[PDB]
Amino acid sequence: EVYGIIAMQAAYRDYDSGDAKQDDNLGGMQLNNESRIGFRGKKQFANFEPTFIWQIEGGYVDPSFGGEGAGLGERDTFVGFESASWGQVRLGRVLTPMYELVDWPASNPGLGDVYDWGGAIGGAKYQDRQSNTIRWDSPMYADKFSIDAAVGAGDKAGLGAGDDYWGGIAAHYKLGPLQLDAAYEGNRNIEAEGQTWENNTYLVGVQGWFENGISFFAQYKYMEADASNGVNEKQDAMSAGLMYTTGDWQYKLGYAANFDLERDGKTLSNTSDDVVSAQIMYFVDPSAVLYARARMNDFNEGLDGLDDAARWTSGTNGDYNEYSVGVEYYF
Amino acid sequence: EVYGIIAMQAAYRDYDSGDAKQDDNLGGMQLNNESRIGFRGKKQFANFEPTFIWQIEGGYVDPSFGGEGAGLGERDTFVGFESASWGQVRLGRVLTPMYELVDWPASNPGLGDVYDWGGAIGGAKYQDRQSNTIRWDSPMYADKFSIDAAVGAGDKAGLGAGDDYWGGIAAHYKLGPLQLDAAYEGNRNIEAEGQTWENNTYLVGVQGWFENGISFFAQYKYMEADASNGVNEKQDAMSAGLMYTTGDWQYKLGYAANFDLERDGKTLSNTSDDVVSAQIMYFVDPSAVLYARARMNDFNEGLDGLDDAARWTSGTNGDYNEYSVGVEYYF
Amino acid sequence: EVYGIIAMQAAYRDYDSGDAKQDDNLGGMQLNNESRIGFRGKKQFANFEPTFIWQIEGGYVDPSFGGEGAGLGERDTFVGFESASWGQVRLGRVLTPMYELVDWPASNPGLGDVYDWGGAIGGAKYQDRQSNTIRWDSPMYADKFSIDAAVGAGDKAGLGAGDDYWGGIAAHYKLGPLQLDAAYEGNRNIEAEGQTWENNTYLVGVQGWFENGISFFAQYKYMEADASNGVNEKQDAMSAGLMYTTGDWQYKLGYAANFDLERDGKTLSNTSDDVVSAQIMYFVDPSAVLYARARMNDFNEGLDGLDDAARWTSGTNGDYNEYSVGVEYYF
Amino acid sequence: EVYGIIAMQAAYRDYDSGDAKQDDNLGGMQLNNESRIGFRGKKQFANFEPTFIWQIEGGYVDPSFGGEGAGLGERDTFVGFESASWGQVRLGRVLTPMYELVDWPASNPGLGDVYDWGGAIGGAKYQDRQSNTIRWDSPMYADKFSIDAAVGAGDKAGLGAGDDYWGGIAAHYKLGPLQLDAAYEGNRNIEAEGQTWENNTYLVGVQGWFENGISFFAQYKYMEADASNGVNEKQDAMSAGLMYTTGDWQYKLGYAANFDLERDGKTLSNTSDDVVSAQIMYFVDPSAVLYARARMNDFNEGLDGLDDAARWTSGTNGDYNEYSVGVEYYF
Amino acid sequence: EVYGIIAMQAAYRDYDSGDAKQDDNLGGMQLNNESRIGFRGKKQFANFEPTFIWQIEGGYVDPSFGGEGAGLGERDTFVGFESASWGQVRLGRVLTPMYELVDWPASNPGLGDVYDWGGAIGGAKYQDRQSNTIRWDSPMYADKFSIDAAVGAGDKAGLGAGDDYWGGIAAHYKLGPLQLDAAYEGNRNIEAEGQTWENNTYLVGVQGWFENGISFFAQYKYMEADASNGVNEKQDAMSAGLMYTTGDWQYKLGYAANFDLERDGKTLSNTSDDVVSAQIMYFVDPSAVLYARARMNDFNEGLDGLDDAARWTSGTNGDYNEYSVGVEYYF
Amino acid sequence: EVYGIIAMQAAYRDYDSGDAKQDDNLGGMQLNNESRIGFRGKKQFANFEPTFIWQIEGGYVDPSFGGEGAGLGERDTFVGFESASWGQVRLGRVLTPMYELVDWPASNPGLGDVYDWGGAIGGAKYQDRQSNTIRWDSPMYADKFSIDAAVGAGDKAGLGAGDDYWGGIAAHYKLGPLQLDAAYEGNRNIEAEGQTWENNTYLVGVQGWFENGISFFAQYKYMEADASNGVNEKQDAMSAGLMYTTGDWQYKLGYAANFDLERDGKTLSNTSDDVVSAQIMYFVDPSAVLYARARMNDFNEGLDGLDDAARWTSGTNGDYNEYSVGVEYYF
Amino acid sequence: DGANSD
Ligand code: NA
Ligand code: NA
Ligand code: NA
Ligand code: NA
Ligand code: NA
Ligand code: NA
Ligand code: NA
Ligand code: NA
Ligand code: NA
Ligand code: NA
Ligand code: NA
Ligand code: NA
Ligand code: NA
Ligand code: NA
C-alpha cells in the first residue's frame, strides 16, 4: 500500500535573540510542509510462520528552515517479522523506545524545542529515530501491558566513522483510564567535544483519558552523562499537557521544562529552558484535523562544553514565540 | 492518484565560448531526462465546504548537466482549498503568477536561456517555483478573465537566513481568439553583491489560437531593479513564437531577446542576449509527443555587479547552439 | 506499475587496516538496507510501431556506511522502444553490457569489493550503470543467443565538465545447461591523474545450471589502460562460484581475485586482491530468500597513480572480514 | 682586422633513448670544435656622416655530429652604419633582438637543447641568426636604457620559396646591479605541417651582478602560435642561472624548462622538457678559459603536429647526459 | 684525562598513533639525560714516531624511554695513532664517515627521527657508531680539503653471527664561507627479512657560515639497496636548517624529509616522513648552552618487508609533536 | 604379442630468437618419426593368483632434433601383477601419476613445450617416465573413481650417483559426462644448482565428452620448490583444449601457459610461457589418423638459477611457430 | 547493483 500524511503548517515566529538582524532572519512567516509519502506491506512466507513486514517512508517534503525535497527512506523504513504470540521484530530505521514517549505524547503541542532535542547535557541524551536499529515491540499482554526494547549502532558508527552504540527499553501499563509509562536509554562510546561519553536517561510518565472529555499527560525525565576524563553532568526535565475534547473540538494546554544542568556537583546558572503552549484543534473530518497554536519558548542563556567552546542547544538561536495554524490529513 | 511526466531529450550542444577546452566540456551529446513522478488527491472534509486539494511532485530524475536522483517535493507541492465561485487557494511550493507566464508560452521552444533565467539585471528579477508561498487562482469569471495572486517568503527567508519576500499578480482576458496577459512581481529585501535590492518586473503579452491552425504568442517584459546604495538598473526583454499545427504536426518558430542593460541611465554595450529556435513536433499519441529542435543562443559579452566582480548570467558559460530530439508522455 | 526489492542485511565487519581507531570506526555491526522502489510502464503509441517503455527506479533507501534516504532516479531510469523482431533500445541510465556480467553472476556473494569496483588499474576500467546512455538489447535469437550493445557519455561529460565517452558490447550463447558469456568495453577521453586515458576491458565467462543441483559460474577479466604520456597499464581478474541447490537450500562458494598490475611491462608487487566467500541461502518463499554469509577480503597494499599521489582502490580502507545474514523480497 | 674564437669541447654523451643501437650511435666521445675565423672593419666615407661597418664571420669549423669545414659568412655577416647619436643599423645576417637574449645569458651552460631551440610549439617560435634582416641597435641612452629592433625575411623567403617574414624588438634597463630585459618576436606566414602559422613569442627577464661575486639571470618565455585551420597553441618556458666569480674561478648552476604544450585549450601530457647543468670555469688567461661541465636533459616523450605525423623536437633523439671539458681562446 | 658532557633535556611528547592508550603511554613528560663521562689520553712511544692516542667514552647515563645506567665503552672508544703529516688512524668504535655528517649538522635540531635512523629502506642504509672499525682522518690539505675514510665489521659480525661488513668515505671542501660535503657508504652481506642485502648510500651537502650571523646547512641523501632475491629498493631524503646568530642567541629552523620508497619500480604510497623544527638557543657560558625546542614529526603509515612482516621504522610508534627545554655543559 | 605405433610428423618450425643462424639452425622442416615397437604379455602363473603382466616398449626410432635409432626399453617397460579386485601393480619404467595427466590430455595438441617440460621452476617439478618405479593402479570402484599411486628412485639414484626419490598420487572421478582429475607429486633430495631441493606439484583438472560431439579438457597446475639454502620458488601453469568431433573429423583448439615465477616473494618479470594451438584431424581408418596442426609458442625471456648461471627452459632456444602434418597408425 | 568508487 501507498499511504501518506499531508501536513501543512503556516507558522509565524517573532524572535528575541539580542541581534536585530538575527531576529529578522530567523523570524517571519514560514510554511512547515511536513507532508510525506510511504510504502508498506506484509507477506506470508511459505516457509516461515511469522508474517514478514516492511515499510519505506519518505521524509518531510518541505519543512520550514529547509530546502525542498525529501528522499524515500528518511523516516521509519525497515523490514521485520510479526507473530501474534511474541509481537514484532523490526530491523532498520525506527524510533527508540525512549524517544517514542518523548515525542508522543510529551512533545505535543510544539513542546519539542524544549523537551525533544532541547537540553544542555553533553553526549547524546537519547537517539530519535535511528538507522541500524533492531527493535522488539511486544504484544499488549492481557490488553494491559506492553514492552519496547531495542539496541542499535550510533550516529557515527552508521557512517563507518565511529563505534557509537545504544540500547533502550520502555514499558507501559494500562490501568483503567490511566496508563503508566517508564523508559530508559543508554548511549555508549559517544565521541563529542574532544571526549568520549556514556549517557543514561530515565523516564516515567502518566497519561489519562476520561469519559467526561478531560485528557492529560505528564512526564518526568532525568538524564545523566559521564565523560572519560571524569566530568559528570545531570539534568532534570518535565513535560505535561492538559486537554478537554468536546464534540469536534480539542483544547490543549502544554508545558515542558528543563532545569539547570549540574556539572561536577556545581549547578550552572541559567541552563534551564521552558515552553508554555496552548492549542485549539478541530476534527474537520475522520481523516484530518485543523489546528491553531501559540507557544512561547524561554531558552537557556548559554553554556560552554568540555572543550571550552560553546555547546550548541535548541537555545543557541535565541528565544522565540510562535503563532501557527495548520492542517493534517491521513490516507 | 499517481501521475507522471516521462520526458527524454537527446541534445547536442555546440559551444563557441572562446575556450576550446571549455567548449569540449560543456558541449557534446547528453540525455536530459526531465521525467518526474507525483502524487495528488482531492478530499471533501465532512465539516468544511471547500474541497481540500494537495499535490507532491518529484524533481527531474536525471537532467543534463546534473547528477541523477530527485526527491519528492522538488516541484509543485502544496495543500489548498477550492470552491466553484471563488477559485482555489494553494499554500506551499508553486509558481508565482509572473513566472507561470514567462515559462509558458514564452520559454518554449528552448528560449529559457534568454527569457527564463537569462538577463543581466541585478537582484531577483522574479522568482520561479517558490516554497513558502500562498497563491490564489481566481475562477475564469464570466468565461472571460482570470486573476492569479500570490505572496511568499524569499529564497533566504526559507532558510531563516534573510527577510526577503515577494508578491505578484497576473491577469488574463479572453477577447475572441486572443488572450491578453499582464503580470507584475516585486521582490524585496534581496541580499546580493553586498547590497539590498528591490525588484519590480512588469509583463504584458498576447496569445492567439485560430481555427485555421496558426497559433502565436508575444510578450514584452520590463525589469527594474534598485540597489540599496542608490544604483538603478533597468532591462527590457521580449519573447515571441509562431506555430502552425496541421494534422499530427506542429511547426514552431521562436525568438526571444533581452536588450542591453541600463545602469544609472547608461546602457552597457554588448549586454544583450537573444535566441532563435525551430522545433518540429509530432503528436505520436494523445498522451505523448515526439520532437526535434534546433536553436541558436547568442549571449551577452559580460558585466560586473556592484561588488566589482563578474555577475553571473546565462551567458557566463558562452554562446552555444543546440540540436535535439525528444519525447514526452503524460499519465 | 509500482515495483520494489525489499532487501535488508545485518553485516558485522572485522577490519585490519593498520590503524586501531580506524578498525574501530569502519568495523562493527551495521544494517545495509538496499530496499528500493520503482515505477515502470509501457505504452503503445498510435503512430509508432515500436512500443514505448519507461522506468524510474529509486536508490538504496539506507545502505551501510551512508545516510538515510534515496531519490527517485538513482538506479535504472530510462525511456525506450521495443519490438518483437529487433529487441529493445533504452535511453537514459542503464547498466553497461559488460557491467551487467561483472555484477551478476560474478559479484555474488560479496565478491564485489574485489571484482566489481576493486582493482588498481588507472583511468576507468569500465562504467557501472551510466546516465546519458543508449543501449540495445537484441531478442534471444533462435532462443539460443543474444546481443547487448551500448554507447554513452562519461561521468565528467554528464556534468558539462569533460568529453569522456565509452562503448561496449556483450554476447551470450545458450548451450544446453551452459551459458557462454563474452564482453568488451572501451572508455575514451578519461581525464584523471593529470593524464588522458583510454581503457579496454575484456571478459569471458561461463554459467552452468545442472539437473543434479550443481550450478557454477566463472569469469576471466582482462583490463588494459593507456595514459596520454605513453604509460601502459594491465591487470587481470577472475571470479567463480560453485553452488549446490537441494530442496529449499543453496550452498554457494565464491572466489574472486585481481592479480598484480603491470605498469610499462614492470610487475608491481602486492597490487593483487582476492576474496573468498561462503553463503547458505533458504528459499523462504517463491518471492523471497533468507541468507547467511561470511567472506574474507585480502586487498592490495597500495600504489601511486601517475600524479605522484596515492591511487584509490577498494583496499585503501584495509583488509576485512564480514559476517552477515539478510533478507530479499521481490514484488 | 681578423679575429677568431678558438673553441674546442671534448664531450662524452650517454643517451637513454629506449633503443640500444641508437644509444650507441648518438652517444660516445666526440670533439665539438666551434672555432671560427672572422674579418671585420670600419670605414668613414668622405661624403656620408655615419661610419660604415661590415663583418664576415665563419661557421664552426668541425662541430660535433657534423662534418668538418665551414664557409666564410655562416655566422654574423652584415654591413651597416653607426653614429654616436642614434646607434647602429645592420643589414645582413644577424641575431634577432629576441634570440640574442634567449642565447645569452639564458642558454649557457648547456641549456640550449631546452631553452634555445627546444620546445614543442608549432610554426617558428623565433628566428635565431637570420639572413635578410635589418636590425637597429640604439645607444645606451643615459647609460641606463637600450633598444634592439629588427625585421627580416623568413627562412623560406630567403630562398625564393616562400613569403615568411618576422619582426622583433627588445629592451634593456639597468637598475643598480640589476638589468631588466623584455623582448618580443612575431613570425608570420610560416608554412609548416600543411598549415600556415603565426607565432608570437614574449620574454621577460632579469640579470644581476653583485660586488661580492654573485651573478644570476632568470627569464620567462611565453610562446603563442596560431595555425590557419583554427588551431591555437601555447607553451611557456623558463631559464635561470646562478654564478659565483672569485679570482680565477667561476661556479655556475643552471636550470631551464619548457612546460607542457597547450593545444586548443587542452594540455598535452609530458610535452615538457628540462635540463640541469653545472659548470666549473678556470680563467686561465685574460683571453681564454678552460671549463668542465655536466648536464642532464630530460625531454618530452613525443607529440604529433597538425598533419598527424610526429613533430620534430629537441627530444626526438632521446634523453641524454653529457660530461665535457673544453677551452676557448679569443683574439 | 677525564671529560664529560652534562646534558639534560626536559621534553613533552604529544602522540597521534591511532590508539589513545598508546598515545598516553608513549607521550607525557620525560627527562632525557644524555650525560656521559669519558677518559682519553695521548702518549709518545719511545720506539714509534706517531703519537699514541686512546679514548673510552661512556653512554648516556639516563636517556628518555630507557632505564638508568651506562657502561664505559658504549660511545666513541678507540686506540689510534697521529702524525702531523698523514693525519690520524683510529681502531675501534667510531662514527662512520657518512653517519658523522648525517648527525652533524643534518640531525640538529631534533631532525634525527626522520633523517638519522628514519627511513624505510631494507638492509642498513648506513651504520652510525660502529665497533670493530678502522677509520682514517686526513689532515686539512692546503687548509681547504680533508678526507674521512673507514672500513669495518658489521653488526652481526661483531657478535660472530654473520659476515656483514662496510666501507665508507667522506670529503669536505672549504669554499670561502662554505663547506662542501660528499660522503658514501656501502654495507654488504647484511642479513634481514630472510634475505641478504647490499646497501649503497650517497650524500652531498653544503654548510655555510656568514659574517652577518646567518648560517645554514643543506643535505641530500640517496639510499639504494639490493636484496639477494633480486628486489631493489630506492629512497631519497633531505635535511636543511637555517640559523641566525646574534649576540648570546641562536635562532633555528630545521626541516628534514624522507621521500616515498621505490620497490622494483613501484612507489610505495605514504612511506615518506618529514619534520619541521624550531629552536632558540642561549649561550649561557663559553662551556654551556640553554635551549628551547619545538618540533612536529609526520611519519610514514607503515610497510611490509620482504618477509611479508611489518618493517620497523621510526614511524612505528606514531606521529608526534615535541616541546622541550634543555641544557648542555662541556667540561 | 608384438605391438607398435607407426607415427610420422612433418613439421616446419619458424623461429624468432633474436639471432639469425640461430633461427636458421633450429628452424626448417624436419620429420619427427615417433614410430615405436613393443612387446607385451599376460601370464597366469600356476602358484600366484594375480596375473603376471610385462611390457618392453622401444623408443622413437627417429625423432626430430635427434639422431636415428632407438633401443628396446626406452619407453614404458615393466613387469607387474594385476587383479580384477585390486587393480595392478607395476615395477619398472612407467609414467608417474601426474605425468600421465600432464601428458594426456593436457599436452596435446603441441602444448608440451609449455605444459610438459616447460616451466622455470628449479629443482624437478615432477618426473615423467621414470625407471626404478613401483606404481599401483586401482580399479574403477563403483564404476566411478580410480586411484594412481607410485614411488620411485630419482634420476641420479638410478645411476648410483645420488639419493633422490619421489612419490605421487592421482585420482579420477566420473561425474556424468565429466571426469574430474586431481594429482600430486613430491620429489626429494634433488641435487641441482649447488643445492638440494624439494619439489611439490599439485594439479586439478576436468575433461568432458558430450553426446553432441563437443569434448574439452582443462587443467590447473601449481608448482612449488624449496632449496636447501632456504630459497622458495612458486609457479603456476594451466592448460585447456576444445574439440568438436563430427563424422570423420576432429577440430581442436588448445591453449596452455606457465605464468611468471615467484622467487622468495619476488615476481620475476617475463618468466612466463604460453602456446595457442589449432588442429584438424581426419579419422582415416579405425586404426589410424591424419592431422594438420598449427601452434604459436611465445616463451619466457630468461632467468638465472641459484648458482648465478642461466637456468635452462624450453624458452632457451627462442620463440617459434610450427606448421605440421602427420599420421599415426596403431597395430 | 552499482559501485562505491572514490
Ligand atoms: Na521550506
Ligand atoms: Na541520531
Ligand atoms: Na509499543
Ligand atoms: Na563502528
Ligand atoms: Na562535453
Ligand atoms: Na489562472
Ligand atoms: Na546507513
Ligand atoms: Na560512472
Ligand atoms: Na540482453
Ligand atoms: Na632561420
Ligand atoms: Na643592443
Ligand atoms: Na630514562
Ligand atoms: Na651499527
Ligand atoms: Na589409473
Author numbering:
A (entry chain F), B (entry chain E), C (entry chain B), D (entry chain D), E (entry chain A), F (entry chain C): 20 to 350
G (entry chain H): 1 to 6
Study authors write:
VhChiP is a chitooligosaccharide-specific porin identified in the outer membrane of Vibrio campbellii type strain American Type Culture Collection BAA 1116. VhChiP contains three identical subunits, and in each subunit, the 19-amino acid N-terminal segment serves as a molecular plug (the “N-plug”) that controls the closed/open dynamics of the neighboring pores. VhChiP is a sugar-specific OM porin with the ability to selectively transport a range of chitooligosaccharides, chitohexaose being the most preferred. VhChiP consists of three identical β-barrels, each containing 16 β-strands connected on the extracellular side by eight hydrophilic loops and on the periplasmic side by eight short hydrophobic turns.
The N-plug peptide corresponding to the first nine residues (DGANSDAAK) inside the protein pore was synthesized and added on either cis or trans side of the sample cell partitioned by the lipid bilayer, and its effects on the binding kinetics of sugar–channel interactions were investigated. Under the applied potential of +100 mV in 1 M KCl, 20 mM Hepes, pH 7.4, rare and short-lived blocking events were observed when the truncated channel was exposed to the N-plug peptide at 10 and 40 μM. The results were markedly different with the addition of chitohexaose on the cis side and the N-plug peptide on the trans side. Strong blocking events at a monomeric level from state O3 (fully open) to O2 (one monomer closure) were observed with 10 μM N-plug peptide added. When chitohexaose was added on the cis and N-plug on the trans side, the K value returned to 255,000 M−1, the value for chitohexaose–WT channel interactions. Titration of chitohexaose into the truncated channel yielded a Kd of 10 ± 0.3 μM and a stoichiometry of 2.8 ± 0.1, while titration of chitohexaose with the truncated VhChiP mixed with the N-plug peptide yielded a Kd of 2.9 ± 0.07 μM and a stoichiometry of 2.3 ± 0.2.
